[PDB]
Design a protein around this ligand. Structure first.
Ligand SMILES: [Zn+2]
Ligand SMILES: [Zn+2]
Ligand SMILES: [Zn+2]
Lengths: 175, 247, 101, 114, 432
């Protein structure tokens, strides 16, 4: 009995691997990797940071780092600036909708890794009110854990996409 | 609570926060602890994903290749343990796809498994040998929820991405695994984020700006193809189900 | 060695060794054996259909399913042989201990 | 600084002074400071009485017991003829009541030929 | 509105006369069927949020439902929505019970019988036993206790607006002789007017249905009531106990009467204390400023007899102690066979503190706080500075407990702690 059942189990895994995987893989299409930002920015090296979908909305909000490609004829220009352009793409065909506006970073916030920024949905503003309403060791002015711990930036970037906005948080990883 | 982390549950006003002893859960309204998930090293956790369809469960991904899921409403109790054969995990997403098989006259594919009575199990306690109704090892976290009125069977898809090589692994129902080989292995670009549009349609976003789309639409639009996936899953379990009672 | 204490244990161990053995063969193996063969036949039909519906050039061989089908048929026939045999074992078991008592 | 006391609301707890897990009624098994099953309020509504035998009972418990034909006027715990202890302020209000019941039962026993 | 907007056009389309009565009646029946369907879908928000503003609609809905299938569909849809949303442990328990009782009163108005109430109750109670703090807060809601007592021993915030709202809902109470016999025998008997009950219209009984036994309920009522009498009875709780007594007696287990008896005794204890004190003041010319309460120790569950720590033998001021001893002696004379023990830890004294600057402060303080402050009473107007060790020896109070008592007077601005010695603040350099 033990031999016969194990005889079926090893043969059963063969059916799944040899045949079922063959059929399932066929009904599954993988789109080739494509560049969409090239049309809008063909002379810049593109660095991508984060992108999420707004619920009940068919638009893709993305955060990109745009660094213009410096040709071999312009020597050592100080325009090697990392620009955190924010745009929108329709979810299906990834089509650009609104003209990107470069967010001006204040000089005090230049000492943070912009690449580590992640998207945080679902009413981040609620915690801001509750932090001051709870007698915790957390102070809001910047949300700071006491006077002796790491400081993390909560960039409530008001990207007005058709009247709605998302929320961002800038983690601290000092360079 | 100050932290650059925390992901809010889309369906319920709860968040998942990270503290030293483990993953912690607090209510937004009361700031009161609800559950604690014991985790050893944060660096091992590739990412954590919430349940989009229900929000009752929570998914945790390990870099070694292990997936562990804990129910939030059960005070952080572990409910299921998953393993994927020899896979390096970079970032995983959990998606639940609800099937809608409306009755159609052109579909004469009647079912007889429902008419046949459901099986049982033999489990022996200290006092005596007892008989209990049969439940699939993974049915506890997949059973039709009491709180879910729309009890339509829910497809469970775990999507896995491998680091350093950009290999895509899709995992169905907790047992069956399917491997898909990507052609674009020339560049080792780290995947930045994974975004879900609807059920079975996913976009992957790498560091270089390239966009990769994974679509399960053809699979979900074919009634027989999903049945093939379901059938191969039932056969493997019952053979082991028999082997359990044989020993 | 045997005595009264082990004799009752011998009958109790022996009786459960057979009457519980017959239950698990009929209430588990028989319904399960039917269900595996049921699913494999539906398993065979589906792959055959897309071999025709798709008309895809590459085909997946069905020799793997038939082996499971014949093997599954073998187990169910083999299960029933044991169940009848354990029935005879029960008859032999009782007649021995009634005299051994 | 001068402290003037305007009003004092003090709380006192009263207990039975018994001339010495055994402050229970031998009949109803309720605490002396509690009520027997037939009374609602402790104290005057359920007073305690002490016998010459130094056996303690609820007024109602021992009266009812003594009123049964089977008691023969004897203490239920020790079987001596139940008479209230003299000189205890607690018994003064009940002496007449208990003399009448014991005398009545003694006369009935003489009539019943036992 | 639909008729005036479309019925003429529809009649022209069909060609039937405009005054077709049966078609209009069928249209009206379909409208009411659609209204029932929409309300069944939306009943959760109707009962949870829109109540009691939508209560009128409920009365309209009650006129329409007629079949058992309607009630079953209604209750199952409501239970699914209530269970989907409210039974979440992530929801605060106070708001959960508030919305729950709102649905109870809403459904009671909709269904006078209350059978649907039993079904929802039977389905939902295990979720109530799942939550731990429900019992404490609900009885405290039952007795309308002040938030200060709530905040003393409960470690999670409770919404005061929710508390007042549930209190308002709880107190809501909207839920010639021989010739008349011939006429009323004829008018009343010939005029044809064409699991237990557990469906009482009282919401407080439904709240009581949580407990497997009302024994714990009445015991805690006793405990809180004993605390109040010790704090001083408010008229508001007399209504509460009246409701408690009224329902229990109607039902009538052995322990239930045990905790049903002395609530009357405690009332009798205070009533006799009010009566005995007047008699005591008449006979012995006792000081009319002392109002003693004579309590039955067994029934007030005051554990005088924790036999383990020698920590409450504090000395009362000699003048007050002598007067209180006079009361004990007279009591033994009036009630022979009884001994009186002073609960030195229980009781309140109203004291007036007069300072050199003319400030008079009147406070209600415990007997312990009065003993501490009395140590600083200077008959000769000399500044009394006492160290912690001197006060502990004089008052026989342990130093940790004395610090808490001294902190009370520091918070009230009476005492100042300088370099380990406590002195009276005689001259406040700040506008009171
Ligand atoms: Zn009595
Ligand atoms: Zn005696
Ligand atoms: Zn008694």
């Amino acid at each position: 009995y033990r031999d016969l059942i194990n005889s079926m189990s090893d043969m059963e895994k063969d059916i799944a691997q040899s045949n079922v995987n063959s059929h399932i893989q066929q009904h599954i299409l993988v789109d080739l990797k494509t560049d969409v930002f090239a049309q809008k920015y063909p002379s810049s090296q593109i660095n991508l940071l984060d992108a999420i979908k707004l619920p009940k909305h068919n638009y893709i909000v993305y955060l990109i780092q745009v660094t213009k490609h410096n040709s071999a004829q312009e020597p050592f220009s100080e325009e090697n600036k990392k620009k955190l352009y924010i745009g929108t793409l329709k979810d299906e065909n990834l089509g650009i909708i609104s003209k990107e506006s470069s967010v001006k970073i204040p000089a005090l916030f230049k000492s943070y890794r912009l690449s580590s920024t992640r998207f945080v949905p679902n009413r981040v503003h609620s915690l801001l009110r509750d932090i001051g309403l709870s007698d915790s060791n957390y102070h809001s002015s910047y949300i700071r854990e006491n006077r002796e711990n790491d400081d993390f930036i909560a960039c409530t970037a008001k990207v007005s996409v058709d009247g709605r906005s998302a929320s961002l948080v800038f983690p601290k990883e000092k360079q | 609570i100050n932290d650059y982390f925390i992901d809010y549950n889309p369906l319920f006003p709860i968040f998942a926060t990270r503290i030293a002893k483990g993953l912690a859960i607090y209510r937004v309204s009361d700031h009161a602890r609800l559950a604690v998930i014991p985790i050893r090293n944060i660096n091992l956790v590739a990412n954590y994903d919430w349940d989009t369809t229900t929000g009752k469960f929570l998914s945790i991904f390990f870099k070694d290749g292990t997936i562990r899921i804990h129910d939030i409403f059960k005070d952080g109790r572990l409910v299921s343990f998953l393993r994927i054969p020899s896979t390096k995990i970079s970032k995983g997403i959990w998606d639940r796809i609800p099937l809608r098989y409306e009755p159609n006259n052109r579909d004469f594919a009647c079912n007889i498994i429902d008419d046949l009575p459901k099986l049982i199990r033999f489990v022996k306690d200290s006092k005596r040998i007892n008989i209990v109704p049969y439940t699939q090892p993974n049915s506890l976290w997949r059973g039709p929820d009491e709180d879910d009125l729309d009890s339509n069977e829910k497809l469970d898809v775990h999507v896995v991405f491998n680091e350093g090589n950009d290999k895509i692994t899709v995992f169905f129902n907790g047992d069956y695994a399917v491997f898909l080989s990507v052609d674009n292995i020339e560049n080792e670009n780290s995947l930045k984020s994974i975004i879900k549009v609807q059920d079975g349609f996913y976009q992957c976003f790498y560091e270089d700006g390239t966009v990769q789309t994974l679509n399960l639409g053809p699979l979900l639009q074919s009634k027989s193809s999903v049945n093939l996936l379901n059938y191969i899953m039932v056969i493997k379990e019952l053979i082991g189900y028999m082997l359990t009672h044989l020993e | 060695s045997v005595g009264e204490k082990n004799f009752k244990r011998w009958k109790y161990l022996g009786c459960e060794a057979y009457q519980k053995t017959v239950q698990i063969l009929t209430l588990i193996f028989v319904p399960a054996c039917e269900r595996i063969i049921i699913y494999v036949e539906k398993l065979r039909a589906i792959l055959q259909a897309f071999s025709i519906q798709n008309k895809l050039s590459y085909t997946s061989d069905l020799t793997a399913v038939e082996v499971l089908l014949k093997s599954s048929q073998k187990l169910l026939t083999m299960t029933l042989n044991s169940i009848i045999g354990l029935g005879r074992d029960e008859t032999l078991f009782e007649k021995f201990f009634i005299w051994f008592n | 600084m001068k402290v003037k006391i305007n009003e004092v609301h003090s709380v006192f707890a009263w207990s039975w002074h018994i001339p010495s897990d055994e402050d229970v009624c031998g009949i109803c098994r309720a605490s002396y400071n509690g009520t027997c099953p037939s009374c609602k309020f402790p104290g005057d509504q359920c007073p305690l009485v002490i016998g010459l035998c130094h056996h303690n009972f609820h007024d109602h418990c021992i009266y009812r017991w003594l009123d049964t034909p089977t008691s023969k006027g004897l203490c239920p715990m020790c079987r001596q003829t139940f008479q209230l202890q003299k000189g205890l302020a607690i018994n003064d209000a009940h002496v007449q009541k208990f003399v009448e019941i014991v005398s009545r039962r003694r006369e009935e026993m003489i009539e019943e030929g036992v | 509105k639909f008729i005036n907007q479309y019925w003429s056009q529809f009649s022209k389309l069909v060609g039937c006369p405009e005054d077709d009565h049966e078609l209009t009646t069928t249209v009206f029946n379909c409208f009411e069927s659609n209204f029932l369907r929409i309300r069944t879908n939306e009943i959760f928000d109707i009962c949870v949020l829109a109540y009691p503003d939508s209560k009128v609609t409920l009365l309209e809905l009650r006129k329409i439902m007629k079949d058992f299938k309607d009630y079953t569909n209604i209750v199952t849809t409501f239970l699914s929505d209530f269970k989907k949303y409210i039974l979440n442990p992530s929801v605060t328990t106070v708001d959960a019970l508030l919305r729950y009782v709102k649905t109870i009163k809403a459904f009671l108005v909709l269904d006078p019988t209350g059978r649907c109430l039993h079904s929802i109750t039977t389905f939902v109670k295990p979720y109530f036993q799942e939550r731990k703090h429900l019992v404490n807060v609900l009885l405290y809601a039952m007795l309308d206790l002040p938030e200060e007592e709530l905040k003393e021993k409960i470690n999670f915030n409770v919404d005061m607006k929710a508390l007042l709202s549930l209190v308002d809902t709880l107190h809501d109470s909207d839920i010639i002789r021989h010739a008349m016999l011939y006429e009323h025998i004829l008018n009343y008997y010939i005029a044809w007017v064409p699991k237990s009950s557990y469906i009482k219209t009282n919401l407080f009984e439904v709240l009581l249905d949580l407990f497997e036994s009302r024994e714990f309920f009445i015991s805690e009522f006793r405990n809180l009531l004993t605390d109040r009498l010790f704090t001083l009875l408010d008229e508001k709780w007399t209504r509460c106990l009246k409701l408690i007594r009224e329902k229990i007696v109607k039902f009538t287990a052995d322990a239930d009467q045990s905790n049903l008896n002395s609530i009357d005794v405690m009332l009798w204890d205070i009533k006799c204390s009010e009566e005995l004190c007047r008699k005591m003041h008449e006979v012995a010319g006792l000081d009319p400023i002392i109002f003693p309460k004579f309590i039955s120790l067994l029934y007030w569950k005051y554990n005088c007899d924790t036999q383990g720590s020698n920590d409450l033998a504090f000395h009362l001021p000699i003048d007050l102690e002598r007067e209180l001893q006079k009361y004990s002696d007279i009591y033994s004379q009036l009630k022979p066979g009884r001994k009186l023990q002073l609960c030195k830890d229980k009781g309140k004294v109203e004291i007036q503190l007069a300072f050199k600057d003319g400030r008079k402060l009147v406070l209600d303080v415990s007997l312990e706080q009065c003993s501490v402050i009395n140590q600083f009473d200077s008959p000769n107007d000399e500044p009394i500075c006492l160290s912690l060790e001197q006060l502990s020896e004089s008052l026989n109070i342990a130093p940790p407990r004395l610090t808490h008592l001294l902190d009370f007077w520091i918070q009230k601005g009476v005492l100042l702690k300088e370099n380990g010695t406590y002195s009276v603040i005689e001259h406040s350099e700040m506008d009171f």
